[PDB]
From a paper:
The ferritin protein superfamily, nearly ubiquitous throughout the tree of life, has evolved to address iron storage, iron toxicity and free radical formation. ,, Ferritins oxidize Fe­(II) to Fe­(III) and store it within the ferritin nanoparticle as hydrated ferric oxyhydroxide. First identified in hyperthermophilic archaea, DPSL forms a 12-subunit (dodecameric) nanocage that preferentially utilizes H2O2 as a substrate. ,,, For these reasons, DPSL was first perceived as a DPS-Like mini-ferritin. However, structural studies revealed a surprise; DPSL lacks the DPS ferroxidase site and instead retains a bacterioferritin-like ferroxidase center in the middle of the 4-helix bundle. For these reasons, DPSL is proposed to lie at the evolutionary interface between the mini- and maxi-ferritins. ,− Importantly, DPSL further differentiates itself from both the (bacterio)­ferritins and DPS by the presence of two conserved cysteine residues that are juxtaposed between the ferroxidase center and the exterior surface of the particle. Together, the conserved cysteines and the bacterioferritin-like ferroxidase center serve as hallmarks of the archaeal DPSL proteins that are easily identified within the sequence as a “thioferritin” motif, and serve to differentiate DPSL as a distinct member of the ferritin superfamily.
Further, if the mineral is indeed present as ferrihydrite, it also suggests a 3-fold axis in ferrihydrite (space group P63mc) should align coincident with a 3-fold axis in Pf-DPSL; and that if particles with a single crystallite could be identified, a C3 reconstruction might indeed resolve the mineral structure. To test this hypothesis, and because the 3-fold pores in DPSL are related to each other by D2 symmetry, the iron loaded data set was D2 symmetry expanded. Masks covering the densest mineral features coordinated by residues 168–171 at each of the four positions were then constructed and used to sort for the presence of mineral at the first site (lying on the z axis), but the absence of mineral at the remaining three sites. This identified 167,240 particles with significant iron density at a single 3-fold. Homogenous refinement with 3-fold (C3) symmetry then gave a map with strong mineral density for the C-terminal coordinated mineral along the Z axis. While the overall resolution of this map was 2.5 Å, the mineral is significantly less ordered. Nevertheless, there was clearly resolved density for a constellation of 4 iron atoms with tetrahedral geometry centered on the 3-fold axis. The density is proximal to residues 168–171 and highly similar to the 4Fe/4O cluster in the ferrihydrite structure of Michel et al. Further, when the Michel ferrihydrite crystal structure was symmetry expanded and superpositioned upon the modeled irons, we identified an extended ferrihydrite superstructure with 13 Fe and 18 O atoms that was consistent with the surrounding density.
Residue numbers in the entry:
A (entry chain F), B (entry chain E), C (entry chain L), D (entry chain D), E (entry chain C), F (entry chain K), ...: 14 to 183
The structure:
Amino acid sequence: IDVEKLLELLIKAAAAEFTTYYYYTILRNHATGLEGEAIKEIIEDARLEDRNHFEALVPRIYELGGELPRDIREFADLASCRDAYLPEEPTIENILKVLLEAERCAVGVYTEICNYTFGKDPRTYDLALAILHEEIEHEAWFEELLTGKPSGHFRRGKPGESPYVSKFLK
Amino acid sequence: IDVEKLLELLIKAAAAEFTTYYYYTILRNHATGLEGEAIKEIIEDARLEDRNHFEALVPRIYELGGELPRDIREFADLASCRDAYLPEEPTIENILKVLLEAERCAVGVYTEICNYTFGKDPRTYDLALAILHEEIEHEAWFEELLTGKPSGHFRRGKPGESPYVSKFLK
Amino acid sequence: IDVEKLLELLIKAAAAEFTTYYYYTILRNHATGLEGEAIKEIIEDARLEDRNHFEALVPRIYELGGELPRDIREFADLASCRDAYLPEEPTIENILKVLLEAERCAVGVYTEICNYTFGKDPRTYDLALAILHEEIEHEAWFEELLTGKPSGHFRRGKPGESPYVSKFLK
Amino acid sequence: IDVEKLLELLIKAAAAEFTTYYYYTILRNHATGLEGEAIKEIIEDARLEDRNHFEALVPRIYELGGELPRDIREFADLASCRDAYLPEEPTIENILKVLLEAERCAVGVYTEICNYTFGKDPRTYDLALAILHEEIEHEAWFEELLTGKPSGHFRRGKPGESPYVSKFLK
Amino acid sequence: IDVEKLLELLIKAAAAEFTTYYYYTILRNHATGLEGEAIKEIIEDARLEDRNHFEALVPRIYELGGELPRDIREFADLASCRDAYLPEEPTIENILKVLLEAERCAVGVYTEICNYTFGKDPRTYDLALAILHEEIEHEAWFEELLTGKPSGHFRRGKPGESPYVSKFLK
Amino acid sequence: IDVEKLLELLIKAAAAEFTTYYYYTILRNHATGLEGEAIKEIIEDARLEDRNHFEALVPRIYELGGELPRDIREFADLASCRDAYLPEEPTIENILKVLLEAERCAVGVYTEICNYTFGKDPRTYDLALAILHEEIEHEAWFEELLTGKPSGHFRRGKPGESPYVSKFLK
Amino acid sequence: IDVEKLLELLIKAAAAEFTTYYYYTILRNHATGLEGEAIKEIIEDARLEDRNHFEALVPRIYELGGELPRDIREFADLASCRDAYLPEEPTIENILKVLLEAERCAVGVYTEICNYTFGKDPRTYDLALAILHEEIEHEAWFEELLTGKPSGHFRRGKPGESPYVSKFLK
Amino acid sequence: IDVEKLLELLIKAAAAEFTTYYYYTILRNHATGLEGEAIKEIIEDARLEDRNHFEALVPRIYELGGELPRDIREFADLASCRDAYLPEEPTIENILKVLLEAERCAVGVYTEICNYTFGKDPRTYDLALAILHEEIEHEAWFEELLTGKPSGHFRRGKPGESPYVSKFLK
Amino acid sequence: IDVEKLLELLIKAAAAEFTTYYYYTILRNHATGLEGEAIKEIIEDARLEDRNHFEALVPRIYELGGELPRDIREFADLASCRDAYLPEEPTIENILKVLLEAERCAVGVYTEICNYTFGKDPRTYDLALAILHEEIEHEAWFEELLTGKPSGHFRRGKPGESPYVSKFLK
Amino acid sequence: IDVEKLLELLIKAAAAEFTTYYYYTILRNHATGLEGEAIKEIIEDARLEDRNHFEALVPRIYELGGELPRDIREFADLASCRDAYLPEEPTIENILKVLLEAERCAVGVYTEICNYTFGKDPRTYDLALAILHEEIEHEAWFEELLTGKPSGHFRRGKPGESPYVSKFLK
Amino acid sequence: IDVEKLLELLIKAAAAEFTTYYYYTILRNHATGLEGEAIKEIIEDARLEDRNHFEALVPRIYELGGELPRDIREFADLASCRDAYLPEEPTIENILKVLLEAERCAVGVYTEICNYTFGKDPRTYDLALAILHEEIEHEAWFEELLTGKPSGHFRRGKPGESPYVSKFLK
Amino acid sequence: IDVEKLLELLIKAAAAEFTTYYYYTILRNHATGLEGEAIKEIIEDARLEDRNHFEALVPRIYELGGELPRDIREFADLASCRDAYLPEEPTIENILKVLLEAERCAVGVYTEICNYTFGKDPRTYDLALAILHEEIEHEAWFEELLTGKPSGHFRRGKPGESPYVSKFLK
Ligand SMILES: [Fe+3]
Ligand SMILES: [Fe+3]
Ligand SMILES: [Fe+3]
Ligand SMILES: [Fe+3]
Ligand SMILES: [O]
Ligand SMILES: [O]
Ligand SMILES: [O]
Ligand SMILES: [O]
């Protein structure tokens, strides 16, 4: 592994997690009405776990000799995923579309990291796998709500419980 | 402060909390169907906290030299808010209207007490403020469900948790 | 079983529990002095459990096709027991007399329900039995304090612990 | 009591509980979309309690001299209730119909056991009563969701909490 | 019910529980060797629950107007079961025989009390039923160890957990 | 606000709390006999909370640039309240008189601090308000015991629980 | 140390603990009225700890090569202290006299064991010391209640907490 | 990876776990006598963890686009392992032989899934690895009991604790 | 109060909290060496509490009719405090200077909000007061470390414990 | 033992603990800067345990017929150790010297009590030993910090945990 | 006391505990089969407590001015007991013989330390006494299993619970 | 995989963990003074986790058919890493150098095992990975303290918490 290339992927992934934690706050607040009450805790589950994903990625970046960018504006510009902006018409189905594209991108970025660190950096692989477990579950929540495909997933007992990345958290 | 005038406000406020704890029991039970399952725990959250509000107001009444009325019928007639009766057509939106008017009146009565004890009775102000925190949150739950205005409030983890009046409880 | 006759008994029993929860609040507050400090937590134990008895009776009423009355004034008028009014002279022995009559009536009403649902409605029998366990223990607390007959009962570790009706509570 | 006749009733009841635990797994997973999210935890509550009912029935069968059948295929054929198959059109209301018939049959079988062991086998009566408490509550959940009749029941705090059969569990 | 006849049965039952708590202490200590290590916790489970049975029977005796005998020697003479004396040859199988006869007698005495208070004293019936649940489980433990008949019972998680008589304890 | 004048008030208030924690130790020990057993835990409740009041006041003194006096003898001389000395005849009613004057003085000193920091030092106001909540409750305990005036206050579950100043504690 | 002489002292001490656990049950139940409500939990504290003292003495008897007597009647006859019989007139002060003599004897017997195993059997000394800590505290509870001498002891948080003999318990 | 081939492997594996949860129930009940008491909790540990393995496999089947078979009879026929039938002579060693073959097959099937998803489906690999951790430990328990080969494994603190598949559970 | 002017202050305050949570992550990581190990948990305490301050401010913004800005870049530009950039020479004392200026500004912004909502918006005042409690404590930690002025403050037991804003959190 | 001479030693020891609890509060607050942050929790550990030592000594004084002095000024004058005054130059090494002399004196006074009650008053010996355990550990903390001699001791998990005197605390 | 002679005894005792923690690991793993499953947790109980004994002895060695040997080989050579080597024929009875001799030697060494520090070093005496409590219990476990002498000891609820040396642990 | 070659690696790795647990005990005790107080808990964190690594490696050795060596001297000679001897001049930086070389070697040995069991022994890979997670974190603690390179790692909440190898522990 070229460590610089892996450092870029991990920094971009952390930027994606950090901006997601802000943008899901707006998306949660606009999940109003009787329809939105059902999905509020699902958005809350994903948002707090995505904040935990930023908390697990940063220690690994500094173990590898990398650093967070000096300016937070530069951090936002580095996100591996497009901003989960609130839709021009914030209906429940339009918000769910935005959440689905945000979590499909997250599954893609952590699949990229796992495919790059497989058998070469076992710690980075295990961190990306732990997050990829939770990104896949986030994607299935929003896919079932939006499309109706049985995903077999239940709701978290507590928001931000993070069953897979907990061993990486303090 | 005229203590008699403040005792009247606190007794009428406690009567509002006590009758609400009965009338929300009826309202919870008629939140039936798929739509009502989402609001049942929100009604349960408010009803148990309103019961805690009665439990916190009564000790303050006796510290100030006041007493609860001898007869419970007289207590009911003294409620600062109109009875949250079940609507003639108990649809979910009609029930939500009743809950919204019940919590808007509760915000008004505790704003009246805070505006009256501000800088004169610091304990009575702090109790009324603690309840006013929860009444405002109750109103925002029902306003978001009925109208769809983003309120930013999440559901309680446990019903009757009462994060603001807990220090006044036993 | 005639369900209407059983619904009347259960509604009157719940009205008795609800008004007891209000009247024991007044009785607790007037158990003052050195004598009253000993019985305050005993009144508090009974009052909170009687509130739990109202919380367990209401779900059964709605399972049976019954409903709580629309107006809380009509609910109070339906109580199976006379109001536990504060005595004209609120001495400790006069308050204990009022508590004793309140809990002897409660044992009577739940014995009436058990004798009516024995072998016909096993759920209603089991609910009435669970409350009758606690009403009998409430009566023995006040009988020992007032008369001095050994009852063998200890004080609850926590008020409203409800060791018998807990399985019916949420 | 003819113990063989009671052993047949308990073995058929446990077969119903065991197959229900499998068939509710399929029903939970197809409760998709915005409507389904509301009932997923309700199906999850019933499925884990029905698994606890199998865990409590089996010890009693062996105390009475009975045994589970050697082959699991023979166990499935012995279920006291028709299989809760997924509907040909798995809409939310069609799934709710299947759940309603599954729990109405369970109330019937445990009423048959209680009516048979009343005053003759107190342990078998008490176990059947504890399960009948939970089957009645399961039926009222799905009856309220499908029809809108007020049932007065709240959601379990945790899935499979089993407030009534817990004393029979390990 | 003749209360005097029922008071005799409950006092004799409590005497059986109290002496069992002492005699099982001796039996536990002589369950030595590799064979006895397996049965030590099973004896300990039964002995601590039999102590809980004495703690639950005594309050009921005093509610009914009865009293424990003045002298503990008179209490021992009133035991409804023969003393679980240590065998002349304290082998594991001979000790198991003594434990089996002790628990078969206990099942008989509490079946006698249930058959006497069925539908006449609901509290006394419910207390005897709760103890009968645990005596039946105690008998099945020693029957499976001594004879090998499948009983379906698992060990208690903690000694003296008393899943059935806990609601009667303090 | 003149900070020196507020530092004097806070130092004198902390000296009152520190000496109270010693003098209530003596008062607790002389609450003997049957009458004194009821008030021992009430004295213990107040003494441990008064110790917590000293623990919350000292950090605020050092934030404002003040310091505790070098000598503990000088600290005692600065108490805002007269010493809660043991009465020459330590009867229960004489001890209660001493406790009542100690807590009436404490309400006065913290009402003085609140009246001085109202709208000018929000942190100092909030600390004095939190203690004033507990001083008022302490006064009501002893006023109810000594005079019999209904106060509406129940006993603390644990001594030194300090429901109002807990957020200021470590 | 003559082990036989020490085995006699420990067996007689355990017999005292066992009979005390029965006789304090009677004494607790007759601590009726308003006066007795204050001492009921104090008797309950001592009785459950004296039961723990029997639970800690028996293992030591078997480590030393001793055994409990075969017959429980022989065990009762070996008690180092006279039976704490209920007084002919069971007033609160007469019951307190019986409890005081019971605990003064217990302090004497464990001082005898400590004076005999000092510097020779460190385990037997440490067990007797742990019980002597609790017997001294039991004596001071009843001495303060009966005579009014300040003893400085507070009530246990939970009955039978046994702060000193806990390490010897299972 | 061909998803259809992987879906077949996971469905057959889930069928093995589900039937094992039933067949180990029979095997547990026939582990009687003094020898069987030692292995009862070991069978109980494996059976409850095998139930957890079914609960973890099903969500993955639905994420991958697969579904459980409509009929439970068809699910039983799909088990990747032969049924753990009770032996014709249910001795402890014959039962242990059945348990050993059941867990050796389970190690084989999850090794097959890991060898198929290695570096291609990281989530499916991680789920199969977590179960393979527990199947290997199950096999070592029964191998040590039957043959005596040192395996180094200790008993679970609680049945069904599932240290490796917990993150996949709800 | 002009609500728009108060919404601007609360949005700018929340932007300060959000950017602080990122910038303190960088500052924590460069608190290296032996000197920095002492301050790492102090920076961690402040950073997690500042994240809680953002979580408490956002719900209030939406109750008042305000919203978070659509773009996170716009949110960063609105921070009421200059960015806590890492110093060009990241020595411990240079880092402490940056932390001190960050928390002195935070005390100023929340003192501005309290001075604006004093007696007009009791909920907004109480939220700003709760944060001002923690900002003052954060400032005192860094002032004591950098300058040596006695502050009287101890370390948090757990990072992000937030003793003052906890009631505003979920 | 002359009880008066032992009462003097115990009263002087309690006065030392009480004044230490005040003087360590000042010493804690002046342990500022980067050097002082390391020793703040060590001073906090010792100060809260010394307060626990005062809480364990006082009950023993009243069991022995002694009493605390009427005036707190007289209590301070009786301290067995010189006041732990803040040094004229409050450097970290000068403060550590003051703490070392305070804890060397405490080890001396409790060694004096143990040498006086050895084999004569086992309860007083055990209390003094329990405190002497903690005083020795306090001395080793400050000796290692000041001089660098390996003491082998670790920091308390929680301040005032008091592992040795906890059995004497309520 | 000659501190050098006592330091040698404690270092040799710690060496015995450290090597025991390794040798019991081998002994645990060879306690295979049906017989060995009963004794596995008993060996595990002793081994984890012997590890705790090493953790408690080392701090005392450094308080007294002693140090652990530089090389671990030198530490092994200093063990006060012969190595608990696995028997040439690792049968259960041969393993039990090794465990019995290991714990008889440990009782001897701590009896030697207690007999040497009796009345001269109270902390060293109390530490050795706490370990001697557990060594005596360890010896009784293996003596009862090997010989069948009633020892009266029950199994630890959790391995390494260490009821007697816990106060010396961190 | 050649199992013998992997058994050698795991035995040498466990020998390294066992000796590290002893040598870090000496290193902890010599981390004296003000500088060493900061690193004492860091050494304690690593030492207790390295002890857990020995506890997780040993079961795997016995599953694979390997055994611990008979003699502990032979175990020490097999350590994969040189002994972490105390430096001739035990300064803080010299001790940190010894800790850094100890943990760099540990990262190397577990990287060797992971590189050898990748895709061939999934259980051995997962155990080595779990330890490698903690060895990497241990190395970064000592690298940041000695050199000052930002590592991003925080201190453990509790010593020996072992977030990664916990699932392999009992
Ligand atoms: Fe357990
Ligand atoms: Fe366990
Ligand atoms: Fe346990
Ligand atoms: Fe255990
Ligand atoms: O366990
Ligand atoms: O467990
Ligand atoms: O246990
Ligand atoms: O345990």
